[PDB]
């Protein structure tokens, strides 16, 4: 009967394909970090450590590669399919409900963006909001109509003088996004279109930022990367008590190879 | 073991293809000069001199081709891959990190744009900012709202009277770009849209220009060319001390076949 | 002529085999550390980081493998074969002189033993003489006939009470080795035979130890390992100026997975 | 991907062979009981009860085999391999780390020797230190130089008068082993060589014995056996939460078929 037995992929190939498509699609729709960072290609699930810097190195002599090494975190969320649903979908209703997968993937991607913007801060992971040498600037009197473009211009000037010209990118909190998206306030048209023309790559909004945020970054690779050990895939754990629990995995590591292209408002 | 040996392409065909794709892609994204100049097709790395003018020529008689001849410069930047990384990527992590290639290509393309806009000025190379018979015009009181469009109009009029009508193109410094991109200042809408409609080919911004710049040019071929000896390719030098150093090459020459279509602000 | 050309293995397969045999043989004869430490098998030259501990680990949740990660050093020594010698040995004298390889390998193995016993101490590497939680004991009045066996017995008792019984091993400095190897001094026969019977694995002498040393360790695996990235092989660098320089490589890392089985005199 | 699936031997045949070789090798090195007891051959994991005596047996009549029957204990220790390590070793580093297996096997073999020498004493299991009819003898004034050989001689005499001549074997505690291994103390040479010549099979040391111990036994089969249900093998339990837990099994039973060849000091 094949269901009075333990395990080894209760779902068929079509159902696995549908599940993976759903999880990948909702991840791609939700994630905002993966739209300004070039990704070090998918290395495979085997790797656990990746270099964090750039290779600039030159009786017996000993040579120790002194760049840096950091371990790759792993993000997961659990979800459960009832016993009878799979057995039905194998003969009964051809669709298999994958609502739980969508919910789990949404939570996982939200945690991913939170991890990129804020590091764990005690495990040693760093982030676009906590990187050392962050080029911090003050962003005060934002409520004044026309006081947000000034901070963006001074920030991009500070990055230009440090040697980092080229296309920029801006990630703003929802409140600041609305404030800059509502008013004209300086000379001409809405004071988010001028910033969008200044950034030349895009101005995005991230829900994970706190009340006041808004870093501008230099989108070029070799400034900041994103090591993808493996993209979001759904994995089967094992039939606990004749049900079927799964897990959606992801293993990303932000590496700030050059923390000069960061400027926090 | 193939790594206790010297040389001859440590990278496989797939890795070479990825490296060349990365370098070409970042070059194409960064370069601004190659968007207003038609390119004399890639001649191959063999050539070292190209004619700089147009052929208009008519006891024994001697005939000397008296047009002009100039040598083609070559732009390069070095980068280094560690020894173990290639050996790993051959069996371990399938990706090979090409961050260094991206950085080197960005620097090389920046130097390319600098070379086009400013010549070497002592090696004899000339440029859109230093060409003789440049049709120089004064650009003063730019800060006055509505004082930038006037200079563009007088410049395009000066080019029209010299016999060079047709589509134009404008390359402005970042400061002037923002100043014209921020204000309405004359009659109607933002005073960069009217200039964009006047130019009919595009108004671009180049980071390599100094504080005050902004030439307008006639985009037609036979007015100004761009001799491409070879596009940006990554070349392997030779394993110095069991590491692997590379070099990204480029050989371009701007030739101003007719310095009437230039006007510096 | 094949010698008016650059590179790619000037030596034939027989000569390479002889060279590798010589270097491996002298290494195996000289090394004393590899006789009390089980080796994590040769991982291949690709790997650069290995775990330093034992896996004991258990809105979305993030899991960071928190054991430890350390990079694998690399030990090398250079040697040079004259130009004409290889060309002769290809037709003239069938032997190729490999004296330089033997000297380089001896120096490399000496540095290896020094590295195992003393860590680099500033690069972060640790060693049987500097490990934290070392169970230090005082070894005074060694000159007194019969005062060396007492220290060994108290040290092995201290290890027994900590939970580490099983076979032991002892590594003594040359001076202490002679002192214990010269005198009877307690009850019966030479006071190095009783210690040898107590250790049950062997009492060895290492030249790299300073004046006063003599740790006793528990030889079992899972107490202390030795990660072998690659054994000593001779590698060819590249014909600099028509000569032929080589290099003998080695990449070992001592990992003290459990610094309870150490006791320094 | 074969790792987004549950179970059925995550390790390949080579890795299983290496694991079993490591566990068996460390067991064989550590165990001291299996060096004086002939083993009733490996019966297979199926059996759970073995006879404990020797068959000496002769309206309807009923015949009940009245020898004895005892159940075979099972000794295990758990260890865990991380999720990513197996996936890496399948493509990345060819070695698989088996340190945990070595530690678990060492603990299991230590428990085995403890079980042989001391029975469970409440489950009914018996041992060379607790067997009834043990021929107990007093071993006092051991510290006196030459007072240990006397006890061994009187013990072997007591066994000889009981009808059990033939080769003997001696298992002594570490303290008594050192005391007899340090002094000459009677007539000639070290007072452990004479006992070794008296025993004719070997004098061994076991760490599991308490402060004062030292039985001498008659090594012949049919006096005392060792029923091996199955030797130490590593078994896979099942992927709990995408990790991989294992277990090393062993099922031995000491059976004292004739408790006359025992004499406790």
DSSP code per residue over B57-118: ----------S-EEEPP-EEEEEEE-HHHHHHHHHS-SS---HHHHHHHHHHHHHHHHHHHS
CB atoms within 10 A of CB A1: 5
Question: Which of D97, D98, D209 is the best residue to mutate to test the C interface, defined by the most C CB atoms within 10 Å of its own CB?
Answer: D97
CA-CA-CA-CA dihedral for A43, A46, A50, A56, to nearest 10: -70
Cα–Cα distance between A115 and A221 in angstroms, integer? 20
Helix, strand, coil share of chain C (percent; to 5): 30, 20, 50
List the beta strands (DSSP E) in C52-165: 61-63, 69-71, 74-81
**Cβ contact D208:D117 at 8 Å:** yes
Cα–Cα distance between B160 and B138 in angstroms, integer? 17
Label each residue of chain D as H, E or C.
CCCCCCCCCCCCHHHHHHHHHHHHHHHHHHCCHHHCCCCECCCCCCCCEEECCCCCCCCCCCCCCCCCEEECCCEEEEEEECHHHHHHHHHCCCCCCCHHHHHHHHHHHHHHHHHHHCCCCCCCCCCCCCCCCCCCCCCCCCCCCCCCHHHHHHHHHHHHHCCCCCCEEEEECHHHHHHHHHCCCCCCCCCCHHHHHHHCCCEEECCCCCCCCCCEEECCCCCCEEEEEEEEEEEECCCCCCCEEEEEEEEEEEECCCCCCCCCC
**Cβ contact B36:B21 at 8 Å:** no
Find residue C95's DSSP bridge partners: none
**Cβ contact B251:B230 at 8 Å:** yes
Q: Residues for chain D: how many in total?
A: 265
Cα–Cα distance between A122 and B259 in angstroms, integer? 62
Distance of CA C198 to the CA centre of its chain: 24
Chain A residue at shortest CA distance from B175: A157
Residues 6+ apart with CB under 8 A from B17: none
Distance of CA B44 to the CA centre of its chain: 18
Question: Which of D17, D95, D114 is the best residue to mutate to test the C interface, defined by the most C CB atoms within 10 Å of its own CB?
Answer: D95
Backbone angles phi, psi at A125, to 5 degrees: -70, 145
Backbone angles phi, psi at C37, to 5 degrees: -125, 125
**Cβ contact A254:A226 at 8 Å:** yes
CA distances from B155 to B152, B195, B205, B218, D75 (A): 5, 12, 18, 11, 95
Angle at B161 between CA B160 and CA B164, to 5 degrees: 45
Chain A residue at shortest CA distance from B184: A188
Nearest alpha-carbon partner for C227 in C51, C32, C46: C51
Residues on chain A touching C77 (C-beta within 8 angstroms): 60-61
| Encoded tokens for B195 | 């200039």
The DSSP 8-state label assigned to residue B184 in this structure reads -
Q: Which helix (H) or strand (E) holds C15?
A: helix C13-30
Cα–Cα distance between D257 and D116 in angstroms, integer? 14
Q: Is D9 on the interface with A (CB under 8 A)?
A: no
Inter-chain touch D5–A6, beta carbons under 8 Å: no
CB atoms within 10 A of CB A205: 17
Residues on chain B touching D93 (C-beta within 8 angstroms): 92
**Which residue carries 């293809």 as its tokens?**
B17
- Which of B97, B103, B183 lies nearest to residue A187, judging by beta carbons? B183
Cα–Cα distance between A186 and A147 in angstroms, integer? 9
Cα–Cα distance between D236 and D248 in angstroms, integer? 9
Resolution (in Å) of the shown entry? 3.4
**Cβ contact D36:D217 at 8 Å:** yes
- Which of D1, D90, D239 lies nearest to residue A238, judging by beta carbons? D239
Inter-chain touch B4–C236, beta carbons under 8 Å: yes
Architecture of domain C147-218: 2-Layer Sandwich (3.30)
| Encoded tokens for A56 | 């600039």
Chain B residue at shortest CA distance from C239: B6
CA-CA-CA-CA dihedral for D9, D15, D16, D18, to nearest 10: -170
**Which residue carries 């859109």 as its tokens?**
B128
Using CB atoms and an 8 Å cut-off, which of residues 47-86 of chain C contact chain D? 47, 51, 54-57, 65
CA distances from D182 to C151, C188, C190, C191 (A): 15, 7, 11, 10
Chain D residue at shortest CA distance from B92: D92
Cα–Cα distance between D65 and C127 in angstroms, integer? 63
Return left, alpha or beta for B185; rule: phi > 0 is left, psi -120 to 50 is alpha, else beta: left
Cα distance from N-terminal residue to C-terminal residue, chain D: 62
**Cβ contact A115:C62 at 8 Å:** yes
Give the count of Cβ contacts less than 8 A between chain B and D. Answer: 3
CB atoms within 10 A of CB A143: 9
Backbone angles phi, psi at A15, to 5 degrees: -65, -40
**Cβ contact A216:A124 at 8 Å:** no
Q: Which helix (H) or strand (E) holds C176?
A: helix C174-182
Half-sphere exposure of D258 (CA within 13 A, CB side): 17
Chain B residue at shortest CA distance from D88: B92
Cα–Cα distance between A253 and A70 in angstroms, integer? 9
Cα–Cα distance between C243 and C80 in angstroms, integer? 8
CA distances from D28 to B45, B197, D23, D74 (A): 69, 89, 9, 18
Inter-chain touch A59–C115, beta carbons under 8 Å: no
Nearest alpha-carbon partner for B142 in B153, B134, B151, B133: B151
Instruction: Decide: residue D5, CB within 10 A, 0-12 exposed, 13-18 middle, 19+ buried.
Output: middle
Angle at C222 between CA C216 and CA C224, to 5 degrees: 40
Cα–Cα distance between B84 and D211 in angstroms, integer? 55
- Which of C9, C46, C234 lies nearest to residue B84, judging by beta carbons? C46
CA distances from B14 to B66, B82, B91, B216, C159 (A): 47, 19, 14, 43, 55
| Encoded tokens for C173 | 């400095």
Cα–Cα distance between B181 and C121 in angstroms, integer? 59
Cα–Cα distance between D8 and D25 in angstroms, integer? 25
List the beta strands (DSSP E) in chain C: 49-51, 61-63, 69-71, 74-81, 168-172, 203-205, 216-218, 225-236, 244-255
- Which of C64, C69, C115 lies nearest to residue A123, judging by beta carbons? C64
- Which of C54, C65, C188 lies nearest to residue D99, judging by beta carbons? C54
Nearest alpha-carbon partner for A82 in A243, A246, A236: A243
Task: Indicate if the alpha-carbon torsion angle B252, B256, B262, B264 is positive or negative.
Answer: positive
**Which residue carries 């350390």 as its tokens?**
C70
Helix, strand, coil share of chain A (percent; to 5): 30, 20, 50
Instruction: Decide: residue B60, CB within 10 A, 0-12 exposed, 13-18 middle, 19+ buried.
Output: exposed
Residues on chain A touching B99 (C-beta within 8 angstroms): 54, 221-222, 225, 257
Residues on chain B touching D92 (C-beta within 8 angstroms): 92-93
Inter-chain touch A111–C60, beta carbons under 8 Å: yes
CA distances from D75 to D23, D38, D207, D247 (A): 14, 20, 19, 10
Inter-chain touch C62–A108, beta carbons under 8 Å: no
CA distance A203 to chain C (A): 27
The DSSP 8-state label assigned to residue B48 in this structure reads -
Residue C61: helix, strand or coil by DSSP?
strand
Question: Which of D88, D92, D94 is the best residue to mutate to test the B interface, defined by the most B CB atoms within 10 Å of its own CB?
Answer: D92
Cα–Cα distance between A208 and B245 in angstroms, integer? 42
Give the count of Cβ contacts less than 8 A between chain A and D. Answer: 45
CA distance B67 to chain A (A): 39
CA distance B187 to chain A (A): 12
Find residue B204's DSSP bridge partners: B171
CA distance A200 to chain B (A): 11
Nearest alpha-carbon partner for D258 in D162, D118, D154: D162
Q: Go through chain D and list every residue after which a break occurs, taking a C to next N gap over 2.5 angstroms, comma-separated.
A: 58
Find residue C254's DSSP bridge partners: C226
CA distances from A224 to A38, A43, A255, B59 (A): 8, 17, 6, 72
CA distance C77 to chain A (A): 5
Angle at C95 between CA C94 and CA C97, to 5 degrees: 145
Inter-chain touch C46–B238, beta carbons under 8 Å: no
Cα–Cα distance between A72 and A125 in angstroms, integer? 10
Inter-chain touch A65–C48, beta carbons under 8 Å: yes
Nearest alpha-carbon partner for A45 in C56, D16, D1: D1
Chain A residue at shortest CA distance from D242: A237
> Quick one: how many helices (H) and strands (E) in chain C?
6, 9
Backbone angles phi, psi at D256, to 5 degrees: -90, 90
Cα–Cα distance between A63 and B241 in angstroms, integer? 12
Chain A residue at shortest CA distance from B174: A198
Question: Which of D94, D242, D243 is the best residue to mutate to test the A interface, defined by the most A CB atoms within 10 Å of its own CB?
Answer: D242
Residues 6+ apart with CB under 8 A from C240: none
CA distances from A232 to A42, A47, A76, A94 (A): 11, 16, 9, 25
CA distance B32 to chain D (A): 43
CA distance D4 to chain A (A): 5
Pairing state of beta strands B49-51 and B69-71? antiparallel
Residues 6+ apart with CB under 8 A from A221: A38, B26, B99, B102, B103
CA-CA-CA-CA dihedral for B160, B164, B168, B171, to nearest 10: -90
The DSSP 8-state label assigned to residue B191 in this structure reads T
Cα–Cα distance between D28 and D76 in angstroms, integer? 16
CB atoms within 10 A of CB D210: 10
């Amino acid at each position: 009967p094949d269901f009075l037995g333990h395990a080894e992929n209760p779902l068929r190939e079509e159902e696995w394909a549908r599940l993976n498509e759903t999880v990948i699609q909702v991840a791609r729709r939700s994630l905002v970090g993966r739209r300004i960072l070039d990704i070090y290609g998918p290395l495979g699930a085997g790797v656990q450590t990746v270099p964090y810097d750039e290779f600039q190195g030159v009786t017996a002599m000993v040579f120790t590669d002194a760049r840096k090494f950091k371990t790759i975190p792993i993000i997961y969320k659990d979800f459960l399919l009832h016993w009878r649903d799979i057995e039905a979908a194998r003969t009964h209703n051809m669709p298999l409900d994958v609502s739980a997968a969508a919910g789990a993937a949404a939570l996982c991607a939200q945690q991913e963006d939170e991890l990129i913007f804020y590091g764990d801060a005690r495990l040693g992971y760093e982030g676009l909001m906590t990187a050392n040498g962050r080029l911090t600037v003050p962003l005060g009197d934002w409520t004044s109509p026309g006081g947000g473009f000034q901070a963006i211009v001074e920030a991009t000037r500070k990055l230009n003088e440090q040697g980092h010209f080229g296309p920029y990118a801006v990630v703003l909190s929802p409140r600041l996004y609305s404030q800059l998206h509502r008013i004209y306030e300086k000379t001409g048209v809405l004071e988010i279109e001028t910033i969008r023309q200044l950034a030349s790559d895009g101005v995005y909004q991230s829900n994970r930022l706190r009340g006041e945020s808004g870093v501008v970054v230099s989108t070029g690779r070799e400034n900041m990367d994103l090591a993808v050990s493996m993209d979001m895939v759904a994995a089967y754990l094992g039939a606990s008590r004749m049900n079927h629990p799964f897990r959606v995995l992801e293993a990303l590591l932000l590496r700030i190879k050059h923390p000069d292209a960061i400027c926090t408002l």
